[PDB]
Structure formats: structure tokens, C-alpha cells
Chain A
Amino acid sequence: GIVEQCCASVCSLYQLENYCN
């Protein structure tokens, strides 16, 4: 999930944009 991808590890814009509608 987003917590493992961007909180537990460093995030990118690539992955943040996977949670936009």
C-alpha cells in the first residue's frame, strides 16, 4: 500500500499519482 510505498519507504510522484481518481 501507499503506507509501505511512501511512509515506510521513500515515495515518488509516479506512485503518488496512482492514488488520484
Chain B
Amino acid sequence: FVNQHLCGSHLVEALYLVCGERGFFYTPKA
């Protein structure tokens, strides 16, 4: 479900599920 165009809340939700308890960083400006 990771192999598509993921934008905004949809990409943050994918980082959330794949990353799990490791956590992640969302830096949209580069």
C-alpha cells in the first residue's frame, strides 16, 4: 500500500504504519 502517490495526511499515515515504534520524521520542505 506503499507503492503509490502518497501525499499529505496519506504519506504521514504510511510513515506511521511502516515505521511503528521507531517513529519517523516528516520534512516536506526538503
**Does the CB pair B19–A13 fall under 8 Å?**
no
Q: Is the interface of B mostly helix, strand, loop or mixed?
A: loop
| C-alpha spacing A21/B19, complex, angstroms | 8
**Does the CB pair B26–A11 fall under 8 Å?**
no
**Does the CB pair B18–A13 fall under 8 Å?**
yes
Which residues on A sit within 8 Å (CB–CB) of B22?
20-21
**Does the CB pair B28–A2 fall under 8 Å?**
yes
Cβ-defined partner of A10 (8 Å) among B5, B15, B29, B30: B5
**Does the CB pair B28–A16 fall under 8 Å?**
no
Query: What are 7 pairs between A and B in contact, CB < 8 Å?
Result: A7-B8, A11-B3, A11-B5, A13-B18, A19-B26, A20-B20, A21-B22
